[PDB]
Design a protein around this ligand. Structure first.
Ligand SMILES: *[C@@H]1[C@@H](O)[C@H](CO)[C@@H](O[C@H]2O[C@H](CO[C@H]3O[C@H](CO)[C@@H](O)[C@H](O)[C@H]3O)[C@@H](OCCCCCCCCN)[C@H](O)[C@H]2O)[C@H](O)[C@H]1O
Ligand SMILES: [Ca+2]
Ligand SMILES: [Ca+2]
Ligand SMILES: [Ca+2]
Length: 512
């Protein structure tokens, strides 16, 4: 019977770089034409589920940016081997379907970034097939100049290669079908400028940049390359946004931020062995708050405009729900609150919001299962390596979960609404932790210019925490928002300076 503190509070749609992102593995999301392959028209058909354009009404998820996995011609179902950087794979649609998707996203306040694969191309990209022919004729000063082609003996020993003619090879860390670009090449830079402009001119808001760890090599400074590319794209589109996958230690992420790239994925906090899920299982609130503050701030030293990119899991990892669901739905809910209420831009993986699991932990295809909009009418999508038979989410599909006020999905929805009511959360920096003499409680102050919030998480699985909020912490403290997983009907309150934070709950404190 305690009033919901967010009732009637005005939400505002984001109009800047700060977004709750949604990663769509295109193959697996929505099939509009019966071939068992997801496509762009399928995404279009579900845009009102993603964002209906009105932050103050409706039953949409509410995400305000999409990251599309590769959409360009490729023989593979994942398409990270790019055969043509200037078109749409026919299974996904045409450039007209792409233009429709952009228009329809933007009408709803949804930004769109593309997976732009700069480390490597397909071995069937025509630029590369020409290089291969020319190398076989001992011509190295044509198309070979686009690619990381050298005599075999040049390569660092632990570098995998593609064998070419006449004793030459091409760097290929990921596959024999993924030859690497020479990022130092004049010709390559020219080509990348053309590809960037091609997509930016179609209304794209920016890029996800895979495999940044492999920009740097024996002769390439990846920071120099990414700075060159990023600044090129800023000239084309001043408010272009990029997020890099740099799957490596913190010091390498610090280094790469000197490029001025907005964001790099925060791998440290992802997966079952990562900070967030590990500490939700271990009930380590205080540790998690400390680690988020220290990491966000360290990265800001390298780039003062860094936008951290928190995530539980992506298309290259086991689904987060494989670890979290067996710990109870309230653990899954807390996890969402923790990663999404950290500074920066969180990335929800499609289907995470309804608890899609991986049927096995070892096969990448099992990380990319079929999105379930309605568990009564299961999808019919083929995913190479796991077939087309759909798993049923424990909580049902989108339609089921939207109706149930206590669903995982509705918890995500509420998190997003709280963010749309409180811009400081995404845009600010953590200026300090707040101790509550309890290792289960993780609390920190996020401040964005003139405005500070106190975010408190109770990681305890079983125990409510009665906390005292003083004027030294937040002057004239009020309860701005709550997230209480046990029941959507349950709210708390701040009364005579005391607030009960239930198990696995989050509260947000703000000055009157
Ligand atoms: C970022 C990218 O950098 C990375 C590489 O492009 C993406 O990963 C994708 O590509 C790899 C490699 O796929 C290619 O090579 C494999 C291995 O030879 C071929 O099998 C594929 O057909 C070819 O496209 C891919 O890795 C799959 C490895 C499978 C191992 C199975 C072993 C057990 C067998 N019983 C990824 O699945 C694909 O996404 C990455 O996703 C980007 O984010
Ligand atoms: Ca289709
Ligand atoms: Ca809405
Ligand atoms: Ca490389």
């Amino acid at each position: 019977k305690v009033a919901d503190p967010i009732e009637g509070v005005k939400a505002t749609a984001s109009t800047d770089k700060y977004r709750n992102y949604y990663e769509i593995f295109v193959n697996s999301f929505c099939d509009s034409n019966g071939d068992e392959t997801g496509d762009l028209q399928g995404i279009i058909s579900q845009l009102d589920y993603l964002n209906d354009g009105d932050p103050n009404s409706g039953d949409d998820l509410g995400v305000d940016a999409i990251w599309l996995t590769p959409i360009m011609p490729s023989k593979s179902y994942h398409k990270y081997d790019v055969e043509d950087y200037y078109n749409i794979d026919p299974d996904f649609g045409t450039l007209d379907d792409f233009d429709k998707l952009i228009e329809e996203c933007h009408k709803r306040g949804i930004n769109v970034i593309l997976d732009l694969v700069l480390n490597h191309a397909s071995s069937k990209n025509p630029l590369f097939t020409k290089a291969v022919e020319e190398v076989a004729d001992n011509k190295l000063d044509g198309n070979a100049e686009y690619f990381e082609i050298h005599k075999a003996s040049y390569f660092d020993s632990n570098t995998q290669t593609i064998s070419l003619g006449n004793g030459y090879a091409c760097e290929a860390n990921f596959s024999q079908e993924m030859p690497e670009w020479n990022l130092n090449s004049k010709k390559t830079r020219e080509e990348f400028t053309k590809i960037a402009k091609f997509w930016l001119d179609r209304g794209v808001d920016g890029f996800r940049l895979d495999a940044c760890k492999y920009f740097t090599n024996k002769e390439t400074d990846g920071t120099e390359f990414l700075k060159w590319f990023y600044d090129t794209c800023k000239g084309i589109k001043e408010d272009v946004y990029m997020v890099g996958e740099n799957w490596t230690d913190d010091s390498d992420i610090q280094e790469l931020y000197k490029s001025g790239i907005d964001s790099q994925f925060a791998f440290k906090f992802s997966t079952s062995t990562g900070t967030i899920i590990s500490n939700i299982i271990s009930q380590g609130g205080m540790a998690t708050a400390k680690k988020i503050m220290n990491y966000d701030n360290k990265m800001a030293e390298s780039n003062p405009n860094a936008i951290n990119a928190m995530f539980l899991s992506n298309h290259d990892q086991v689904r987060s729900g494989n670890a979290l669901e067996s710990q109870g739905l309230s653990s899954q809910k807390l996890a969402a609150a923790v990663y999404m209420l950290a500074p920066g831009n969180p990335f929800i993986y499609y289907g995470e919001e309804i608890g899609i699991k991986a049927p096995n932990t070892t096969n990448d295809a099992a990380y990319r299962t079929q999105m379930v909009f309605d568990s009564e009418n299961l999808p019919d999508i083929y995913v190479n390596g796991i077939g087309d038979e759909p798993d049923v989410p424990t909580g049902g599909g989108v339609k089921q979960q939207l109706a149930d006020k206590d669903s995982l999905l509705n918890y995500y929805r509420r998190i997003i609404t709280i963010k749309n009511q409180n811009p400081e959360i995404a845009r600010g920096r953590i200026v300090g932790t707040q101790g509550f003499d309890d290792k289960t409680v993780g609390a920190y102050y996020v401040e964005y210019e003139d405005s500070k919030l106190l975010i408190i998480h109770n990681f305890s699985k079983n125990d409510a925490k009665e906390l005292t909020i003083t004027d030294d912490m937040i002057k004239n403290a009020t309860l701005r928002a709550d997230l209480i997983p046990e029941s959507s009907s349950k709210h708390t309150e701040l009364k005579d300076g005391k607030i009960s934070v239930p198990p696995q709950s989050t509260v947000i404190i703000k000055s009157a």
